[PDB]
Design a protein around this ligand. Structure first.
Ligand code: NAP
Ligand code: ZN
Ligand code: ZN
Ligand code: ZN
Ligand code: ZN
Lengths: 353, 353
């Protein structure tokens, strides 16, 4: 009934061992030994309270690959030994229009995996995958295809589904279509990977000239634009069918909309604290479209994993021990990872002795 | 892995939560969820460093009852779900004369359950039953009969085997035999219970007249003798087939030997710091015998449990939570318990949250 993770106690975001009372496995619950957990920039936003919604102490982590060690009496979707994943949320109300039409990810009572409010269990705060053992409803766990490496698959549970889902939603998943990806980070590099697997033409828009070689080589993007180079950006005006914006800091979207063809679709998935400034003319003139996307439904996540397993899509990762997590967080803040940190949780000393 | 117990850090003996590295279940090892652990004066002597051999931090506990939760691939003597006990020691060299003949309790390289030196694992210190999970060689685990309460059985693993083994060895084990028990603490009350289960007539011998009602009421002894009453002692001269001497305070042995019939047997299980004064004539004249013993072999312990299960022999206990342990120890220093504390380990919060 005691679980063990690493938590932040205040806005410094400094992580250190934390023991806490864990939820007991109920009839519909699955017990998961955490093997790997990706570090998402959302975890950094939360532990530093950049959105103002941190409930300290915070146990981060919501890109989880693990193995089932026990299931409740009512569980039928999983059994001990199954390789499974947990993403950004672990529960929902189950009844509202969103929950009833397969869009539980937009439920107003969503229970986040990390720093969420467990409405079905006395409103306790949820502790994420920076911990040894999770207890999750069978209806919010996904199966990891055996063809995927467990560490390279972990960032798919948030980074991957968040970019995969809008590509399917907005028909930005067909050969010949031209997609822009803004911010070649965790989400961004997954967008490039999935877009190229769909056969799309991909332009990367980046503030980091040093990412050019890997973007055009390893990742296979077709073009690379430096966003603070007015000449490069102007040359690409009105060339894109769609653009996925993953930028985590405040930024201007007018130059990004300028890259879209008339009627083109911008998908915002980055979540900076500073509001985006949208002049009306920048969407009126060419009938352009802006949409937000939040991860995917559980079924969306499973479909993304099935696709990744069939096409060999995995994140480019740097695997680290938990004792390195504060250095990893600092490097993520400094934009110094290619392109996702993954914590080897099961191989780390989680408790201090 | 990491295990969780309560440990002393210095000679104050004050116990508080303590996490430590646990050794891995090997091929011949058994994993035991600790349910109950008795407390006895040996634990107090260790944690207060009164023998100068405390290796801090010290996790006490050597009267352990638990349930098997996992076994190594080569284990044949136990399976998950078995109710088991662990006594004073958990390993031995296995090769010496004592070990090879089933008397490993006399191994010079004995591995104690608490504050022992695990010679087979880099001499690491052993942590006792004041903890949540133990890993022990299958050859040093005993089976607790289901006919016994798990908490009342725990002190049998120390005091019970200490008094049972000599009763069986020296034929002080049949109706019509008259047994004296010197002292009325943990060991004394155990000796009376086993003696009664054998059908013997039991005389409690004490230097404190105040223990009379205790001996004749609660415990149901047949007679009570004040060791200072010269006339009453003289009237009982040469009436006892055996005596179990449990007293740890300095005391004269000659008056107790006088109670023995010729060829009678005295068994010393308490250890006074002052040597016993034994005039040769006191044993020569009537061919009397004096022997000592502590806890027995694994086989001794199992034979004691089998007998106890067949006759309903259980210790008189007071069950306490771990967070009360320091108060229990203070009370035990004054012998303010009837007659043994047992910690409800599985029912206690062992970690800090
Ligand atoms: N919508 C959802 O459901 C969802 C899911 C997951 C994450 N997110 C959010 O998406 C964002 C990205 O997450 P992530 O894990 O991918 O983060 P990340 O790895 O840090 O990548 C973000 C990227 O944004 C770009 N960037 C950063 N600072 C910038 C600046 N000052 N100006 C311009 N560009 C900048 C960088 O790319 P370049 O170096 O190429 O410029 C950087 O690599 C975060 O806000 C996070 O909370 C949202
Ligand atoms: Zn995320
Ligand atoms: Zn809902
Ligand atoms: Zn003992
Ligand atoms: Zn030996």
């Amino acid at each position: 009934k005691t679980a063990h993770g690493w938590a932040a106690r205040d806005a410094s975001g400094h992580l250190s061992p934390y023991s806490f009372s864990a939820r007991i496995q109920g009839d519909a619950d699955v017990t998961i030994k955490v093997l790997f957990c990706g570090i998402c920039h959302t975890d950094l936003h939360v532990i530093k309270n950049e959105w103002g919604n941190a409930m300290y102490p915070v146990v981060p982590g919501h890109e989880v690959v693990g193995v089932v060690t026990d299931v409740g009496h009512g569980v039928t979707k999983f059994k001990a030994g199954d390789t499974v994943g947990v993403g950004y949320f672990v529960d929902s109300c189950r009844t509202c229009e969103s929950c009833s039409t397969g869009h539980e990810n937009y439920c107003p009572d969503l229970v986040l995996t990390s720093n969420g409010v467990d409405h079905h269990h006395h409103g306790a705060t949820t502790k994420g995958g920076f911990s040894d053992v999770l207890v999750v409803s069978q209806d919010f766990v996904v199966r990891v295809p055996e063809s995927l490496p467990l560490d390279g698959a972990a960032p798919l549970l948030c980074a991957g589904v968040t970019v995969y889902s809008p590509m399917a939603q907005y028909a930005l998943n067909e050969p010949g279509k031209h997609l822009g990806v803004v911010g070649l980070g965790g989400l961004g590099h997954m967008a490039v990977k999935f877009a190229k697997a769909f056969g799309m033409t991909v332009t990367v828009i980046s503030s980091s000239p040093g990412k050019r070689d890997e973007a055009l080589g390893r990742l296979g993007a077709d073009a690379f634009l430096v966003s603070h180079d007015a000449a490069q950006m102007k040359a690409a005006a009105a060339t894109l069918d769609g653009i996925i914006d993953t930028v985590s800091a405040g930024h201007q979207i007018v130059p990004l909309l300028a890259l879209l063809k008339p009627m083109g679709q911008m998908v915002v998935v980055g979540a900076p604290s500073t509001p985006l400034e949208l002049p009306a003319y920048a969407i009126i003139t060419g009938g352009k479209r802006v949409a937000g996307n939040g991860v995917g439904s559980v079924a969306d996540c499973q479909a993304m994993l099935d696709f990744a397993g069939e096409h060999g899509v995995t994140a480019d990762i740097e695997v680290v021990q938990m004792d390195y997590v504060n250095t990893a967080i600092e490097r993520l803040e400094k934009n110094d990872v290619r392109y996702r940190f993954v914590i080897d949780v099961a191989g780390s000393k989680m408790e201090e002795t």
